[PDB]
Symmetry: D3
Subunit: 203 residues, 6 copies
């Protein structure tokens, strides 16, 4: 029962991170999972293969790049990161919804190799708030992060849904809503309620 793939993107300081987290805490694994990426970097203390990432050796990662195994990948200051098309494809095949957290670039790539995916973009409520959230806990470092954020936000129009994260809860509800709504699509419902519809039409 082909599940849906959600590409979620947002400039640092909108909650993209937290929201997806919160969403999964109220969703059974047979309903919603998060996408798991492949990486060549050493797992940190506490991490675990299969959950956080799919830790593979540098050569394995390359063997894959060659055979077009990744839906998207990129080398980030040292190591490689990638979204195995077979990994996300397998789970979606079991009727599970998958959430993929990526930047606008990877978004475009995935959205290209997979037109059925839905994409959600989260935005901060105002520039002051974006600023405040970014400053988190040098005026020079901030100015850079703020700029990187504006860059990211430029691609907002490329997405399917737009969530403005003013108040966290409301935002988490908007997210939950997008999911639920999609699950109410005819293709999906026709599948889920096969038995019921059969009975109803048959005398």
């Amino acid at each position: 029962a082909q599940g849906t793939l959600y590409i979620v993107s947002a400039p640092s300081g909108a909650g993209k991170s937290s929201l997806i987290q919160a969403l999964l805490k109220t969703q059974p694994l047979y309903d919603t999972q998060v996408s798991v990426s492949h990486t060549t970097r050493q797992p940190r203390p506490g991490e675990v293969h299969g959950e956080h990432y799919f830790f593979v050796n540098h050569d394995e990662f390359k063997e894959m790049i060659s055979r077009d195994a990744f839906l998207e990948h990129a080398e980030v200051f040292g190591n490689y990161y990638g979204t195995s098309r077979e990994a996300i494809e397998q789970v979606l095949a079991t009727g599970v919804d998958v959430f993929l957290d990526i930047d606008w670039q990877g978004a475009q790539q995935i959205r290209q190799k997979m037109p059925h995916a839905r994409s959600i973009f989260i935005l901060p409520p105002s520039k002051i708030e974006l600023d405040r959230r970014l400053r988190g806990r040098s005026e020079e470092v901030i100015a850079k992060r703020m700029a990187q954020a504006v860059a990211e936000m430029s691609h907002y129009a490329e997405y399917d849904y737009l969530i403005v994260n003013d108040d966290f809860d409301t935002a988490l509800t908007d997210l939950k809503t997008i999911i639920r709504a999609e699950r109410l699509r005819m293709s999906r419902q026709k599948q889920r309620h096969d038995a019921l519809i059969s009975k109803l039409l048959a005398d």
Copy 2:
């Protein structure tokens, strides 16, 4: 800017009626509205022009039929009933969402003249429940029931023609599913881009 048009259909005994009602009680007029039909029949005690129907004289109704003013119409045992395409189009123009309650036939026609509209189909949770709900107050000839049940099955055959399917098992849950479809659509990019024009402007500098 442009609001969405929702075509809602369901066999008698699924709540199509009640659900739309309940939905509007929690929605301001600048957000959501039920469509209002044009009729030639005399208003009953308590009704009011503009709310329940658009009461017009037999000739006015005909003048409209001619100028293709109706999105759909039909003569039911005596009088004429119609959904003015103007009356809708205009309100969609003010950014309001419009709910149109119609049978599968009219659904197809509208879905034809306005291929932007979204359509929702409501279904009963089981045959026993559909039956129970249909039997209503519980005082009808086994003969009348058998007919209504048949008319319902006919209606349900077209379920696959719709965009969304809601299974009305528990009323509340169903009213939430409905509310959800609406809210979700309002989160579409085209819509959000419009609503938050000012914000996005500021953000991009």
Copy 3:
């Protein structure tokens, strides 16, 4: 299948009235309805036969008393009020839940004639609040209040006779407790076995 009959009682000033009202505004007629009583009094402006009451003439009401047609009845300062047993029985038969608002006396009678009914009692959160609520618009003689307060204490004495007890401190919470009692009962095996006949069949 067979719906449940809820006998709801409470001393004036706990919200028994409002709560049942609020409950029905969020419930379709094929799941929960309120019980409609018979009365001989003239309908007031706005009322309507079939919804608020079953307005019958003084003689019709008596013809019924004789044939043990009422589940309970009583003559209140002038007119007669009654709960047609044929009426509540026909409705429960369609799987609808019926709410009957009555005093402790009528409660006992119905609970007698229909041991399958569930009963809920609503109480005020404190004596001060009961008092406050009773004083209503704050325009009554200290004498009238003292009487109403007494009538209330009388009523509350029978609380232990009921199945569920709801303490109406905050309205919403109370309306949720009510809703909860209903929903829970609907989750009983007998009920669920019926509702999901088809599903269980397929599963086994």
Copy 4:
């Protein structure tokens, strides 16, 4: 001065597990706690006596069987498992509600030595969904599945023996149904009469 004991059972693939978990995350320990069984098997890495199980030696377990100390017990491929009538009686004695996750067999035993317990049965929404959930991660032999599916159908046969039936279609709704059953029971007269002793006193005076 008296809590309720909830026997919860369900075929693998309905969420019985998850639901009880979720329920406890929103319930203080003086309100709701889980049951703790007695077992003779060696504790696994990470387990701890008093929380997961009450690890006792093979002879201790037998000494109890004799003195009718268990509400129910059974020997499962090697070791003994049991629900101490007293261990529970203690907690229940502090006004805490206890949730006992067991199979239909154990259910019958407990339901026998404590006919004051309430029982809840959780069911999957359809056979396709039960199947889908059972297939889990999706990496098993069509042979293993066919077995687990059969074990599930067996389990579901005893559904009618229970007090409440929850159909786990949508997780949240199910978790609410569960929460509801609890809350409702807590509204019973015997319970409320206790909790609001002081208030009722004042009111009748």
Copy 5:
């Protein structure tokens, strides 16, 4: 035995009207009522003295104006409308919360004589939305929009500010302000007198 008085103001097109309505539909009369105004106009079919309005004769209404009995009043195309200072004062005395819908001017006046008033200001989510909701001749609109901006200038004078983006959320914010106030110590100390007594004994 003391309720709060809520002064609610907002520029036309924020929902001030609808929100207060919606609030009362989920609130019992012994908790939160709305202010009943005095009027000289004839009651319409279905209305009733005491509930919708306080129907008084033209002279009675004047007798009051003179003795500064009204908190505010105005003559609208024919009749007089007023909010009796004594009518509110009586209901707050029964522990009921009262909602007063008024313009910024009347707000200032009430905010000056009456002990215990909280004020809430509702605002539209954006200018486009305010415009959309307001929308007639381009001439009439331009006027209503201007009257709105005037009104909004006094937002800072209020205690709470609600931004009505999505109706529901707004109705929740409103409900929240109320509930929160009811959790104030003075209030709670009263409501739970009996409980606290028992606890400390």
Copy 6:
């Protein structure tokens, strides 16, 4: 942006602990955080400086006491514990709301150096329930209970000193009351005027 400081106090057995916990699980860090105290005691296994406490040496702690660096402090059987005026002040400066769990004494001190802070007091629903909750697992000498119950009554005497009073009858409702107090405060004009600077600007131009 300037955040609010919440002083939360309650007699043992009202849930003060649990409630604050539950509150933070549904609140992002850029909105709500908990207060980190300074202490002179040795960190236990698993603890970490910056998260659980601010572990400082006995002399450092004294150097602070002198310069009125603490909002409140007290020496508990051996070591010193304190709430740094600057630790809180810093975060509050980033627009985050801070929750401080303390006894009535420390409450008074903080409320005195920061008269802007809001204070919330949680109470048990009745004496029986307070008792029941205090008795905990139910394994304490009638002597130990009588003491804890007395310490609780002492604590509750200062309830009137607080801003908000929450009666923890049912956990959920209580957690909602708490959440409500927070939300409401965030709707204060000073706060809203800040958060919606941009919007108000546009609206008035």
